[PDB]
Design a protein around this ligand. Structure first.
Ligand SMILES: [Ca+2]
Ligand SMILES: [Cl-]
Length: 123
């Protein structure tokens, strides 16, 4: 769920408020996403979007009433490392992995302020 994804990004980027810093950035970071990613950070968000789309395709995710944004899973942050839990069932585990991979991706790419609150004409 979004609560967990927020904590994961803070795990990798302890100075950030991720639901502010990484929402409405580029063509992909935030609800929806279309067009060509504007930079590597925006590409991290495109990959994450694709990951959530694949999660919705899984037989195990079709059995729950809640989407990737509201589906709670278990993970830990320790020494700024993210670990998804073996106690997660299949859908939860898949979403946990999407989130972990994106949090790590965000931490490894430049942040370009010119792409924050991007005009949708660009997408
Ligand atoms: Ca998106
Ligand atoms: Cl990690």
């Amino acid at each position: 769920a979004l609560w967990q994804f927020n904590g994961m990004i803070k795990c990798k980027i302890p100075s950030s408020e991720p639901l502010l810093d990484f929402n409405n950035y580029g063509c992909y970071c935030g609800l929806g996403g279309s067009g060509t990613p504007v930079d590597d950070l925006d590409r991290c968000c495109q990959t994450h979007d694709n990951c959530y789309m694949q999660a919705m395709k899984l037989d195990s995710c079709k059995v729950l009433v809640d989407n990737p944004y509201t589906n709670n899973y278990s993970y830990s942050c320790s020494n700024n490392e993210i670990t998804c839990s073996s106690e997660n069932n299949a859908c939860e585990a898949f979403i946990c992995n999407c989130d972990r991979n994106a949090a790590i991706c965000f931490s490894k790419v430049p942040y370009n302020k010119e792409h924050k609150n991007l005009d949708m004409k660009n997408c």
